[PDB]
Amino acid sequence: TAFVTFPEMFCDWGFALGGTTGAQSTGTAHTHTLNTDGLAALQIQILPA
Amino acid sequence: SAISNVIDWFNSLLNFQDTTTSNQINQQNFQIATLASGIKKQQWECRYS
């Protein structure tokens, strides 16, 4: 029994990326291929006193 | 003594009668209230309760 601001499964795990990106900022035009090496999850925020 | 005992038994029966009626009303109202209230959706699942 508990209450959480958002499910703890996100805090414990992540998602594997997939697909293909878009255009680049500069240089030769190309698109990279996504794979399981990319992880989508929550971030960490630093905070001073 | 016989009439006194009958008086006492009738008073006991009336006490049992009122207690049972009050208990029935309380139990039914408690069940109705429990059914009306209960689980509510958390903040993240939806905005409204």
What does this protein look like?
This is part of a larger assembly, with 2 copies of chain A (49 residues). Chain A is largely without helices or strands and 49 residues long. Chain A is built from 1 helix and 2 strands, in the order H-E-E. Chain A has a two-stranded antiparallel sheet. Chain A is elongated. In chain A, 0% of the residues are buried. At the A-B interface, loops of A face loops of B. It is classed as viral protein. Keywords: Mycobacteriophage, phage structure, Icosahedral, cryo-EM, protein assembly, virus. Cryo-EM structure of Mycobacteriophage Douge Central fiber (gp20).
Question: Could you name the key traits of this structure?
Answer:
viral protein, little secondary structure, 10% helix, 8% strand, phage structure, elongated, 2 chains, Icosahedral
